[PDB]
């Protein structure tokens, strides 16, 4: 007999460690490629002269065994920083002084409204041009842009591994969106600290070239910077990594990493104290998160953490959600045995 805490720590030390090592090995491959694409595009096109990589706290998702690992990266147009659409989305009017380069390929309209779809298509052509420049120079033989789709996706192969790197374009917006204003006023019990809530609200968000799942002028709210600040002794990050590895090991698609992060943030508001996230509390927080996940799957309701009226499960197949909920209950019933099966 060993405690569930001990088994969870063995899972961290073996399975989560392998996940981390796999992420690191991939990053060493694709980071110079993305840096090279950004460098070429900002040198070659005046619309992208201020493009930069935004370093996110969480950006790695493994797929089913046999499928490429996935990375989601945001590239920010720093010069465009800002000082009826569906929930989660907005239009973007850019500063008139920044308009003129975007008249090329009609990326901006007569009102200053920047078209996310056209911006993305232009960037995709330029990213392809950057890759072809390296191939002409004798490099990057196993790098391509994925044809079609609504996304700019790099396919990279190295030493047997396959990687799929999504590149989204972003604009910093110093205004906290109305869709998320309830996040500021939400009744809490000490977590996050009120001053941290205030600071995040004042910092704002990013607007990114993602389209709604349920028009080309729409941009998507991204709270990546706020999320990083909230996770910046404590087993909060450890139990999130355990859940992410479990999602992948047990192939719980269409559940996503971001769903698990969302549930952890809500659990941190419900359990605000440091003692509730001590080392000794690991197993009970793990179980609490699985119970929250099962409840969200059975109701097909997973509210976004900042925009509570956006349901992250709205487009999932409800029968598949029921099947996933049944699997989660099996983990809850025999978690030590599940973990032991995966540790081997």
From Swiss-Prot:
**Disulfide pairings:** none
Key words of the record: ATP-binding, Immunity, Innate immunity, Magnesium, Manganese, Metal-binding, Nucleotide-binding, Nucleotidyltransferase, RNA-binding, Transferase
Recorded family membership: Belongs to the mab-21 family.
Matching entries from Gene3D superfamilies are given as: 1.10.1410.40, 3.30.460.90
A biological process from GO? innate immune response
The entry's Mg(2+)-binding residues are 70, 72
List the taxonomic lineage. Answer: Eukaryota, Metazoa, Cnidaria, Anthozoa, Hexacorallia
The identity of this protein, by name, is Cyclic GMP-AMP synthase-like receptor 1
Which prosthetic group or cofactor does it need?
Mg(2+); Mn(2+)
